[PDB]
Amino acid sequence: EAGITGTWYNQLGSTFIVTAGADGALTGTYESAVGNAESRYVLTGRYDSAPATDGSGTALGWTVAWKNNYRNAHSATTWSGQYVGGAEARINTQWLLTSGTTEANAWKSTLVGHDTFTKVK
Amino acid sequence: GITGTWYNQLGSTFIVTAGADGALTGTYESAVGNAESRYVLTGRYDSAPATDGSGTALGWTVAWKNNYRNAHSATTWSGQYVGGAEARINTQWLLTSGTTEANAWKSTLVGHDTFTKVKPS
Amino acid sequence: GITGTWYNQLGSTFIVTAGADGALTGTYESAVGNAESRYVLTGRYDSAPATDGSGTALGWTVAWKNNYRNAHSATTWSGQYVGGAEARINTQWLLTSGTTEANAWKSTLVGHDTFTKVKP
Amino acid sequence: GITGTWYNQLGSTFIVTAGADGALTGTYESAVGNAESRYVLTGRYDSAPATDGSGTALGWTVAWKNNYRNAHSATTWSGQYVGGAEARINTQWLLTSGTTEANAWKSTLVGHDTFTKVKP
């Protein structure tokens, strides 16, 4: 059991639902606490499907481009992190958010931050 | 356009297809690190970019497991495609390795890659 | 309110004085509190922040050399001080190690630290 | 090899003195012909680097306030100096702006710059 498939929450009011395939694929959706369709976006990613057995976390990453049928922010976020299992399972990530810019504004195109996701809201 | 074969400054090879739905699919071969042969990638891009001269936002993930090796890590690239006489994809990236909790502070490398359609070998 | 003793989530200790000009000076060490683990730090902060509830931007550097050890590396922290009932400094950091040219792609780690005036 | 004037490709200049105690001190000029574009910088470097071809680790901070302007932000650069006939300082940087708590998630930009001893 990879423990990754299911619904995950951050503390800022966001939810994502992911399926972890046997081949290393991550597929799902990223949405708001609200759950309205205008706030739901496609996500795709990859994870290590044969992690080490010594207590290390499971490395993974995924991308959301912030376009759906209703809105387009001309940007994309990537999260890079690891899953840590157990009774208090969590995904610890750092992320990069890049917006489309002109070349003169490219120096300010990319934000960086961190997010932790848990199975309980 | 984004579909094609790209090379970064280290000689790594990025073969990608951009789908009409915003999907990126393809393979990645790294010239550096604990890696051999090709790895699956998946990602997303803005399929309706702004018309004001801004670049096209995108991102993708590779988990560093294939049939030959497993590095227990994953890299995400976040960036934009800039069309023109010499098209380029400018990225920043995060590489996370699976670690124990005591080593999680040193789990994540950061860097930047530039891709072009001409090999700078 | 920046001047004083601060601790991060891992037990390291940050002793800093903020000057009227914008200067940060002090020492950075581990929880063990031995002399071998203490390093000089220098940095800068916004000495006239906005009055709309925003934090105070700041940053500082430690090179990991002292009279006992040299790791051939340096960390910079970039963040903001948030005043109030529970004072906090929220940061992200970059640690760069000296490398050969062929290894420069793996020279730099990134992470985040939260400091408070009370030990974790 | 660090002391002197360095240029990036975007039109900035900085002049730095590397002290024997590991200090970096100097001025950062964001625009070529503007005196209201000069800011204090302070940092640290490895004063005893390896002699095997590795670079020299360093970092520094500018807070974007002077006697004329205040952007309520600060940048830290973390990187290494590489010597030789075409000397360079290769960095990654973090820029944090003071925000309210509700906007702290978008407080920090990340990027990279390369400095050389000759103008681009």
**In chain A, domain spans:** 6-117
What span, in angstroms and rounded, lies between the C-alpha atoms of D44 and C41? Answer: 8
Q: What method did the depositors use to determine the structure?
A: X-ray
CB C46 within 8 A of CB C24: no
B45 appears as a binding residue in the annotation: no
CATH architecture of A6-117: Beta Barrel (2.40)
Best mutation target, D110, D112, D113, to test chain A (most A CBs within 10 A): D110
Amino acid, res. B78: S
**What is the distance between the alpha carbons of residues D97 and D108, in angstroms, rounded to a whole number?**
7
Asked whether C58 and C47 are in contact (CB, 8 A), the reply is no
Q: Is B62 helix (H, G, I), strand (E, B) or coil?
A: strand
Query: How many H-runs (helices) and E-runs (strands) does chain B carry?
Result: 0, 8
**Tokens describing residue C66:** 């002292």
Instruction: Output the CA angle D51-D57-D60, nearest 5 degrees.
Output: 150
Ranges of beta strands (E only) in D4-117 are 4-7, 13-18, 23-29, 38-45, 56-65, 70-82, 88-97, 108-116
Classified as helix, coil or strand, B119 is: coil
Residue whose structure tokens are 């393979």:
B27
Residue B46's CB: how many other CB atoms inside 10 A?
24
Angle B20-B24-B25 (CA atoms, 0-180°, nearest 5)? 115
Instruction: Name which of A95, A96, A121 is nearest A109 in CA terms.
Output: A96
Are the CB atoms for C82 and D65 separated by under 8 Å? no
For residue D69 the two structure tokens come to 């302007």
Number of H helices, E strands in chain C: 0, 8
Helix (H, G, I), strand (E, B) or coil at A107: helix
Residue A14 C-alpha, separation from nearest chain D C-alpha, in angstroms: 13
Quick one: which of D46, D47, D10, D45 has its CA closest to D28?
D10
Is B6 annotated among the ligand-binding residues? no
Give the class (CATH, top level) of D4-115: mainly beta
What 3-state class would DSSP assign to C2? coil
Nearby residues of D38 by Cβ (< 8 Å), 6 or more positions away? D27, D28, D29, D30, D66
Beta strands D70-82; D56-65: pairing state: antiparallel
Tokens of D22: 């590991």
Distance CA B22, CA B42 (A): 11
Q: Is D91 helix (H, G, I), strand (E, B) or coil?
A: strand
Among D40, D59, D63, beta carbon nearest to C74: D59
- Across the interface, of B106, B108, B111, the residue whose CB is closest to C105 is B111
Q: Which residue has the tokens 């739905």?
A: B21
**Do residue C108 and residue B105 have CB atoms under 8 angstroms apart?**
no
Tokens of A112: 């960086």
Q: Which two tokens stand for residue D28?
A: 């950062």
Q: With respect to CATH, is domain C4-116 assigned 2.40.128.30?
A: yes
CB atoms within 10 A of CB B102: 9
Task: For B104, name the nearest residue in chain C, comparing CA atoms only.
Answer: C111
Which helix (H) or strand (E) covers residue B24, if one does? strand B23-29
Residues 6+ apart with CB under 8 A from A84: A57, A58, A90, A91, A92, B101
Whole-angstrom CA distances from B9 to C61, C103, D86 are 30, 14, 19
Give C-chain residues touching B111 at CB under 8 angstroms. Answer: 105-106, 108
Measured between CA atoms, the residue of chain D closest to residue A11 is D105
Backbone dihedral angles phi then psi of residue A39, each to the nearest 5 degrees:
-110, 15
Chain B residues with CB-CB distance to D112 below 8 A:
92, 112
Report CB contact under 8 Å: A112, D108: yes
C-beta separation of D90 from D114 below 8 A: yes
